[PDB]
Amino acid sequence: LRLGSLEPDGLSYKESFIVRSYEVGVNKTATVETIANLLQEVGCNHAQSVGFSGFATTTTMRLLRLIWVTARMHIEIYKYPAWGDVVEIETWCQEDGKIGTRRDWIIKDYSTGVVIGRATSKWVMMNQDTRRLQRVNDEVREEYLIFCPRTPRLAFPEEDSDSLKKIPKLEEPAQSSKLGLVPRRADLDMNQHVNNVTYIGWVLESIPQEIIDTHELQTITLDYRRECQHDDIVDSLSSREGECQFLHFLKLSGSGLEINRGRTQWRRLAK
Amino acid sequence: LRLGSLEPDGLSYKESFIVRSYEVGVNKTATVETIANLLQEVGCNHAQSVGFSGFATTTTMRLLRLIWVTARMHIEIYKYPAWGDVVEIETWCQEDGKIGTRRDWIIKDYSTGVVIGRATSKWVMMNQDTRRLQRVNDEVREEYLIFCPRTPRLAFPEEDSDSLKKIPKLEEPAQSSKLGLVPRRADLDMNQHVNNVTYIGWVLESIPQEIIDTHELQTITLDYRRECQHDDIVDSLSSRECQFLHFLKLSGSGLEINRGRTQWRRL
Ligand SMILES: Cc1ccsc1C1=NO[C@@]2(CCCN(Cc3c(F)cccc3F)C2=O)C1
Ligand SMILES: Cc1ccsc1C1=NO[C@@]2(CCCN(Cc3c(F)cccc3F)C2=O)C1
């Protein structure tokens, strides 16, 4: 009784959500964290519907002790849905160069069929024993390429997409910082790993209150380098680079080692 | 396409939820926080369906500068639903003595119609300016009592309900504690207030890892005393009385935020 299903061609997956009272923030609309969680939810349901499995592995991936890891996540929201709004999310995967796979999403207001947001993500294979990036042969690829559109389908079809823009390391000292952030138990998933959405909240903690009060987020790009461990302590840094952009850097308090880096783009709210 | 509606008599409200991948924890089942959020969600939809309003106020409440505040929240989960499980939640309110109103919930597996959980909560009216409990006359009450069963409907009908057992103050030092906890921006709601579910996470942070690894939560009772403010620093304490007593206190002053009881069953 899910209202979540493969499309007729079996190469993309759609799921609808009614935005809940507790999912909205100050703007009376769905938080970035809610959106990120819905993108993940539809990914997982898609994975289950075509027979993968927490890590979206194939038979041969489990055989070679390989797992998918996020290199990049990019979310663009044109309009945050309010409480009671039904949103429909379509998601699909595609081959990305010689090391990567993409997952893309399109977010539509279910009522109007208008696109209100889009996301894309770059995934690489890692040997779970050695933590090394591992290229795989064509038959490993064929196991998931079956379930991808044959001709390029891009959520970001434009020429020089912000989705692909490199993120530099911001220069210390940062204009803005939230220091000594620690995972809570509620920030661990079903496999005892720190959830991506934890990193979106920590990025957003670095934004000055003045920006949060007068602007909402249009884009977030994260490049992941390391997993935060359950007893790690983290600093969220930001600097600027009716519009503003911020660079972001998450680093370990002790060692200064990069957890991830980010870019946010904001638009002034006039009402 | 809500699947969320007043019952025929208009005196209770039912809503169904499909449990999502991100809503389950280590035990491969919906977290306490997910459950708490669904109970709140069905409360808010109920409030909107009979014309209240974020604060579930009536006309005369807004006039007397009164708001609802939770005195007690009690949740019993007999079975945590897995990812893909449809759960149905019925909720209703009832007059509770001379000062109090109750909201009750019953949680059913939609497929079997089996009760897998139940919750009850005690609410008082408070003057938002003075933070004092304020009794009101019968006509103020009648504004919300219209929308309640007149005769006893109890989620906890049993004689000496755990839901009504007093919570004593645990003795320092606590067996278990998480110190210097701070609300995140993401722990504030639409009105810049710390969400109840933040308190459930903080209660759970005080539970020894050994208990989390071998048991799941069957009951949680919280008595609320104060709101945590956005830049407050909080200590979450626990000791066994398996059952645990809980105490949330301000790091600075030592003042009680709330106190609690959890009951655990072996996995
Ligand atoms: C969104 C999400 C959450 C946990 S893992 C994950 C993933 N999103 O994209 C990934 C990488 C690429 C491999 N797959 C498997 C896959 C196909 F390749 C094609 C069609 C469906 C499908 F599940 C992913 O899902 C991982
Ligand atoms: C749902 C909500 C949001 C902010 S406070 C609150 C509450 N949930 O339970 C309470 C207690 C009793 C008063 N009401 C109003 C009410 C009826 F009295 C009867 C039927 C529906 C209804 F919304 C509550 O909802 C407070």
- Do A4-157 and A176-268 show the same overall fold? yes
The strand pairing partners of A108, in sequence order, are A88, A115
If you ran DSSP here, which 8-state letter would residue A194 be given?
A: B
What is the resolution in angstroms? 2.3
CB atoms within 10 A of CB A165: 11
The b/e string for A170-189 (b: 16+ C-beta within 10 A; e otherwise) is beeebebbbeebbbbbbbbb
Phi, psi of B22 (to 5 degrees): -80, -5
Spatial contact of B148 and B95, defined as CB atoms under 8 Å apart: yes
CB atoms within 10 A of CB B27: 15
If you ran DSSP here, which 8-state letter would residue A163 be given?
A: G
Give the ligand with the smallest distance to the CA of A13. Answer: 1
Spatial contact of B22 and A37, defined as CB atoms under 8 Å apart: yes
From chain A, pick out residues whose CB is under 8 angstroms from the CB of B26: 188, 190, 192
Phi-psi region of B151 (alpha: psi -120 to 50; beta: other; left: phi over 0): beta
Q: Name the residue among A195, A196, A212 with its Cα closest to residue A204.
A: A212
Rg (CA), chain A: 19
Measured between CA atoms, the residue of chain B closest to residue A204 is B185
CATH class of the domain whose range is B4-164: alpha beta
As a whole number of angstroms, the distance between CA B183 and CA A233 comes to: 16
For ligand 1, atom 26, name the residue with the nearest CA: A56
Burial of A246 (0-12, 13-18, 19+ CB in 10 A): buried
Spatial contact of A125 and A95, defined as CB atoms under 8 Å apart: no
H/E segment holding residue A6: strand A4-6
As a whole number of angstroms, the distance between CA B115 and CA B109 comes to: 7
Q: How many CB pairs under 8 A join A and B?
A: 77
CA distances (Å), A48 to each of A13, A142, A189, B87, B175, in order? 11, 18, 17, 20, 42
Q: Domain coordinates of chain A in residue numbers?
A: 4-157, 176-268
Q: What is the residue type of A5?
A: S
| Reduced 3-state DSSP string for chain B | CCCEEECCCCCCEEEEEECCHHHECCCCCECHHHHHHHHHHHHHHHHHHCCCCCCCCCHHHHHHCEEEEEEEEEEEECCCCCCCCEEEEEEEEEEECCCEEEEEEEEEECCCCEEEEEEEEEEEEEECCCCCECCCCHHHHHHHHCCCCCCCCCCCCCCCCHHHCCCCCCCCCCCEEEEEECCCHHHECCCCCECHHHHHHHHHHCCCHHHHHHEEEEEEEEEECCCCCCCCCEEEEEEECCEEEEEEEECCCCCEEEEEEEEEEEC
Estimate the crossing angle of helix B196-205 against helix B32-49, to 10 degrees: 170
Question: Ligand 2 — pocket residues by CB below 6 A?
Answer: B 43-44, 46-47, 50, 52, 55-56, 68, 93, 101, 103, 123, 144, 147-148
Å from A19 to nearest chain B CA? Answer: 10
The strand pairing partners of A88, in sequence order, are A16, A108
Spatial contact of A1 and B110, defined as CB atoms under 8 Å apart: yes
CATH topology of domain A4-157: Thiol Ester Dehydrase; Chain A (3.10.129)
A212–B201 C-beta distance less than 8 A: no
Would residue A228 show up in a list of annotated catalytic residues for this protein?
A: yes
From chain B, pick out residues whose CB is under 8 angstroms from the CB of A236: none
Å from A85 to nearest chain B CA? Answer: 10
> For chain B, how many residues are written?
267
As a whole number of angstroms, the distance between CA A174 and CA A157 comes to: 34
3-state helix, strand, coil in chain A (%, to 5): 20, 40, 40
Phi, psi of A86 (to 5 degrees): -85, 130
The strand pairing partners of A178, in sequence order, are A236
As a whole number of angstroms, the distance between CA A204 and CA A216 comes to: 11
Å from B50 to nearest chain A CA? Answer: 16
Q: Name the residue among A193, A242, A201 with its Cα closest to residue A220.
A: A201
As a whole number of angstroms, the distance between CA B17 and CA B198 comes to: 21
Chain B residue set in contact with A, beta carbons under 8 Å = 1-2, 18, 20-22, 24-26, 28, 31, 33, 37, 40-41, 44-45, 83-84, 86, 110, 184-186, 188-190, 192, 195, 197, 201, 204-205, 212
Q: Does domain B176-266 have CATH number 3.90.930.12?
A: no
Collapsed DSSP state (helix, strand, coil) of residue A261: strand
Spatial contact of B220 and B200, defined as CB atoms under 8 Å apart: yes
As a whole number of angstroms, the distance between CA A150 and CA A137 comes to: 18
B201–A185 C-beta distance less than 8 A: yes
| Strands lying side by side in the sheet with A243-252 | A4-6, A13-18, A86-96, A100-109, A114-127, A66-77, A215-224, A258-268, A243-252, A234-240, A176-181
The strand pairing partners of B219, in sequence order, are B76, B263
CATH topology of domain A176-268: Thiol Ester Dehydrase; Chain A (3.10.129)
As a whole number of angstroms, the distance between CA A147 and CA A215 comes to: 39
